[PDB]
Amino acid sequence: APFAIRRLNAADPDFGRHLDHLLSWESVSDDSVNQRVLDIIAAVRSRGDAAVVEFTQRFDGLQAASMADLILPRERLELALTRITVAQREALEVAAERVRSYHEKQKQGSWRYTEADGTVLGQQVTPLDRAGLYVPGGKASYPSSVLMNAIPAKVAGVSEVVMVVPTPRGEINEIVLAAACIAGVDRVFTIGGAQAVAALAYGTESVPRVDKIVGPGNIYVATAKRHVFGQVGIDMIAGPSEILVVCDGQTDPDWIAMDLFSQAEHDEDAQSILVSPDAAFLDRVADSIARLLPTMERAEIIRTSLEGRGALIQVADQAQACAVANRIAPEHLELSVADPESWLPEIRHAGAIFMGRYTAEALGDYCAGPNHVLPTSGTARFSSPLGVYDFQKRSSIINCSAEGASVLGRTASVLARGESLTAHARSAEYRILDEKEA
Amino acid sequence: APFAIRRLNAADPDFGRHLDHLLSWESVSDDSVNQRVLDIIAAVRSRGDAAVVEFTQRFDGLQAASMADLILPRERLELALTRITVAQREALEVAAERVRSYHEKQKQGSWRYTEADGTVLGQQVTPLDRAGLYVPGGKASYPSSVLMNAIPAKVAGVSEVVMVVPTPRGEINEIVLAAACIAGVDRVFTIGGAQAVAALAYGTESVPRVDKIVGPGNIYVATAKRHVFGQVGIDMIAGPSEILVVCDGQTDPDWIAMDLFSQAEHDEDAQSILVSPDAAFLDRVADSIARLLPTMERAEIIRTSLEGRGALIQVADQAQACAVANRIAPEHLELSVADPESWLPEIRHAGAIFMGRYTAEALGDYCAGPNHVLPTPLGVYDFQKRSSIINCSAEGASVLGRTASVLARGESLTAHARSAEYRILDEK
Ligand SMILES: NC(=O)C1=CN([C@@H]2O[C@H](COP(=O)(O)OP(=O)(O)OC[C@H]3O[C@@H](n4cnc5c(N)ncnc54)[C@H](O)[C@@H]3O)[C@@H](O)[C@H]2O)C=CC1
Ligand SMILES: [Zn+2]
Ligand SMILES: [Zn+2]
Ligand SMILES: [Zn+2]
Numbered sequence: 001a002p003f004a005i006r007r008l009n010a011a012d013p014d015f016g017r018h019l020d021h022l023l024s025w026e027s028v029s030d031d032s033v034n035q036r037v038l039d040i041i042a043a044v045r046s047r048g049d050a051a052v053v054e055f056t057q058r059f060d061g062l063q064a065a066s067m068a069d070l071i072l073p074r075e076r077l078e079l080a081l082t083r084i085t086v087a088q089r090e091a092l093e094v095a096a097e098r099v100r101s102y103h104e105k106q107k108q109g110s111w112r113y114t115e116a117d118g119t120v121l122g123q124q125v126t127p128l129d130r131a132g133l134y135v136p137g138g139k140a141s142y143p144s145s146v147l148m149n150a151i152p153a154k155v156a157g158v159s160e161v162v163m164v165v166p167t168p169r170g171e172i173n174e175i176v177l178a179a180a181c182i183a184g185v186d187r188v189f190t191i192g193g194a195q196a197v198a199a200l201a202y203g204t205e206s207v208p209r210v211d212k213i214v215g216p217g218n219i220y221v222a223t224a225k226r227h228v229f230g231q232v233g234i235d236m237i238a239g240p241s242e243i244l245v246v247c248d249g250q251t252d253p254d255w256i257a258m259d260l261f262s263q264a265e266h267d268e269d270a271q272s273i274l275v276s277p278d279a280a281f282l283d284r285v286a287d288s289i290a291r292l293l294p295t296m297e298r299a300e301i302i303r304t305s306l307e308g309r310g311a312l313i314q315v316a317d318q319a320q321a322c323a324v325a326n327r328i329a330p331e332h333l334e335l336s337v338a339d340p341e342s343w344l345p346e347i348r349h350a351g352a353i354f355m356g357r358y359t360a361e362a363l364g365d366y367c368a369g370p371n372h373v374l375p376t377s378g379t380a381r382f383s384s385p386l387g388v389y390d391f392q393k394r395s396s397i398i399n400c401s402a403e404g405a406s407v408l409g410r411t412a413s414v415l416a417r418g419e420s421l422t423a424h425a426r427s428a429e430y431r432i433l434d435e436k437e438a
Numbered sequence: 439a440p441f442a443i444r445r446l447n448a449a450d451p452d453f454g455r456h457l458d459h460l461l462s463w464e465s466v467s468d469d470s471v472n473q474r475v476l477d478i479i480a481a482v483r484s485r486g487d488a489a490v491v492e493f494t495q496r497f498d499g500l501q502a503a504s505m506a507d508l509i510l511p512r513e514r515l516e517l518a519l520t521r522i523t524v525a526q527r528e529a530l531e532v533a534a535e536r537v538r539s540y541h542e543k544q545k546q547g548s549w550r551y552t553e554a555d556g557t558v559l560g561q562q563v564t565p566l567d568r569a570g571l572y573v574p575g576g577k578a579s580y581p582s583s584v585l586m587n588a589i590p591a592k593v594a595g596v597s598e599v600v601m602v603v604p605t606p607r608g609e610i611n612e613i614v615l616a617a618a619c620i621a622g623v624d625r626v627f628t629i630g631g632a633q634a635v636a637a638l639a640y641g642t643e644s645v646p647r648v649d650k651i652v653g654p655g656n657i658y659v660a661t662a663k664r665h666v667f668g669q670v671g672i673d674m675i676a677g678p679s680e681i682l683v684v685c686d687g688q689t690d691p692d693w694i695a696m697d698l699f700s701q702a703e704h705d706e707d708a709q710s711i712l713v714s715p716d717a718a719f720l721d722r723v724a725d726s727i728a729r730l731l732p733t734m735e736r737a738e739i740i741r742t743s744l745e746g747r748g749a750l751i752q753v754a755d756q757a758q759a760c761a762v763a764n765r766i767a768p769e770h771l772e773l774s775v776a777d778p779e780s781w782l783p784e785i786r787h788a789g790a791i792f793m794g795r796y797t798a799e800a801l802g803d804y805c806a807g808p809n810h811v812l813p814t815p816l817g818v819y820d821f822q823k824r825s826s827i828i829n830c831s832a833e834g835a836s837v838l839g840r841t842a843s844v845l846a847r848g849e850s851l852t853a854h855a856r857s858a859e860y861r862i863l864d865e866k
């Protein structure tokens with residue numbers, strides 16, 4: 001039996017609820033994951049290294065007695081570099097070059113500016129002492145995620161960049177370790193899930209407490225990241241793995257099927273949805289999916305995710321396509337249409353957007369990591385708090401001259417007195433100067 | 439009778455334990471506040487306006503028949519601008535011009551760049567629909583906080599900026615309301631605490647759900663902000679009112695005492711600490727504190743703050759002074775020394791820094807506005823939403839797909855590889 005992708009129609013009256021169920025249902029159960037994540041964090045906070053080794057054994061299926069078996073030295077990273085092919089080393093280095101060159105152009109440092117009255121203003125910019133990189137490794141390996149977060153941290157000057165990556169059944173991915181070596185990662189712990197997030201956020205006897213945790217992850221990593229919010233810095237919690245492809249029917253249906261396959265091969269909980277007003281095109285995408293799926297090397301993962309969350313949605317016209325897209329509110333939108341800048345005005349709820357027939361998630365995954373912008377010299381001219389800025393701390397500076405204090409204190413005194421904050425007022429008035437006073 | 443500020447010495451072998459306790463000591467356990475904040479949030483989502491009114495009555499001591507009695511029309515803001523003094527209005531208007539001028543120059547919109555191979559990259563920038571601004575009630579409320587938060591949101595194009603400010607026992611701060619008029623606040627609700635944050639984060643019948651919540655508040659506001667993170671954008675959790683003054687001993691001791699008093703007078707949980715290598719200077723500040731405290735209108739709040747969290751700390755030298763400062767990680771640091779740029783490199787864990795003998799933390803609370811120079815991402819930027827755009831040409835996808843395909847195949851992510859490979863062109 002040829003796999004039959006789930007078909008939906010915005011004309012059918014049950015579309016509203018049928019769509020709401022596809023986006024909402026959860027097999028892992030909510031509050032269930034939340035409770036287990038809360039329990040894991042409390043354990044690592046109390047029992048420390050012992051808890052992480054036990055959780056690593058239970059959840060990752062590992063056979064390690066001490067924390068030391070879960071710590072990879074820098075030499076193990078350099079050795080991984082030698083165990084990968086030449087094509088894979090250069091591909092890692094080519095990606096590293098573009099990432100590193102971009103972040104070097106965006107790095108901003110400390111500055112001072114002297115006003116007319118002598119007052120000095122500015123910012124002190126210092127790198128965070130410690131940054132923690134979560135690299136997902138549960139159901140696949142993601143080396144580009146290492147480069148995307150470790151390189152801007154090193155460019156910022158973060159002295160210690162620590163990486164956690166789960167090694168299921170003790171299997172070690174040399175391409176991911178080789179990326180860590182090229183990216184300048186200092187230490188690699190072979191742990192994952194909520195226990196690894198806990199170990200970096202609070203610290204164990206063997207895992208250092210970091211200033212910021214970054215990286216994508218599954219429901220446990222995402223849930224653990226929102227809990228440690230406040231205790232430790234975090235980038236952005238990433239929602240469930242999804243792609244929404246919106247096509248006008250003029251893209252090769254195999255490309256669209258493979259684009260949906262690419263998100264689907266991530267994990268069995270992945271959500272791949274296609275929306276199009278072209279009915280005959282949607283039939284071809286179904287024919288493309290059935291033909292192409294069996295040969296796929298991860299056809300079991302793809303079939304599972306498509307069954308659970310995949311959908312081919314028919315809409316009446318471009319306007320309905322955009323309405324369905326705004327309901328779905330995708331973090332990643334593939335605008336596979338001829339006039340994609342003409343569809344964007346009516347698409348208000350979407351994070352990263354791939355536009356046209358030649359761009360898909362695979363390019364975003366491997367070549368566009370920071371804020372989902374592609375690192376080039378031209379894109380560098382446009383500043384971002386993401387990337388190098390996020391691995392830096394900025395302290396504002398004010399150094400008043402005697403005169404500058406005098407003019408500022410007059411204004412401060414008026415407002416502070418009006419608010420009965422007399423200590424504010426008097427500390428400012430102490431510095432007001434009148435040359436006629438002897 | 440005379441107040442005696444707590445004294446610690448880094449020459450004492452046990453100093454670290456006392457400093458750890460000074461920085462960790464809390465009056466109301468964070469778990470006690472946590473449960474209260476979580477239950478309030480749950481109650482606001484469940485019962486909407488009804489919960490907001492009940493909590494306003496309990497915590498603000500304000501009889502209110504309906505949610506309608508807690509909504510302040512924008513015309514009341516225009517009235518407030520009428521009731522303040524000439525000097526206060528010009529101080530607010532002059533600061534507002536500098537804040538507004540600054541953010542107008544810093545604003546960035548949507549952009550596109552076309553690479554040499556035809557690939558287009560860029561960002562589609564859209565103003566947030568609604569922003570919520572928290573402003574503490576009563577007199578201990580900086581109007582500069584209203585100007586600094588509502589003005590960049592308006593410059594960004596946020597259509598509805600909503601202020602929440604509790605009116606304890608029905609008391610209004612006309613300077614604060616006037617600053618909201620100048621700043622372009624569209625609507626005001628006289629509510630506060632965790633229930634105000636919860637109402638903005640999720641929406642009630644009368645309180646609109648906003649996209650981002652900003653502004654300073656005590657532990658209940660900050661804890662509510664931590665818990666609503668995810669449902670709504672937030673600025674920073676914001677720490678407790680705190681000042682660390684580091685002095686070489688050559689600043690007027692009355693000035694240092696007043697600088698400590700100014701932070702301590704915000705609320706009873708404020709923390710004011712002085713560190714110096716000059717033991718006689720610390721005795722002079724200690725005497726200044728005792729003499730000056732009874733002259734202060736908010737002496738009762740200051741005393742409670744200094745007793746709970748205040749300290750004067752002696753150290754050996756600049757190096758130890760800087761070491762202690764780095765451990766305290768002060769949200770506000772006053773480097774009251776001769777060469778402040780020489781101390782700062784050793785104090786990297788501090789927040790905003792006030793340098794020299796002529797710069798008090800009170801100047802930060804009453805910012806008279808930036809200038810033409812502070813330009814060259816925390817103002818207009820944080821009231822915009824950004825969408826990254828990658829529009830590869832055929833050739834651009836070919837260059838990028840070559841690198842992506844190798845790594846994806848290396849990790850056996852074959853759908854990724856084939857998806858990229860469909861767009862790779864054969865070379866000449
Ligand atoms: N560009 C991007 O944003 C990318 C996003 N992703 C997405 O992040 C996710 C990665 O997930 P995985 O492959 O599984 O690796 P992962 O590292 O995110 O999760 C594996 C960890 O989950 C924990 N875990 C597994 N079962 C558990 C259970 N019953 N109870 C408690 N903990 C458990 C384990 O500690 C395990 O180490 C995927 O959904 C992927 O689509 C992947 C890489 C990059
Ligand atoms: Zn992917
Ligand atoms: Zn993403
Ligand atoms: Zn501050």
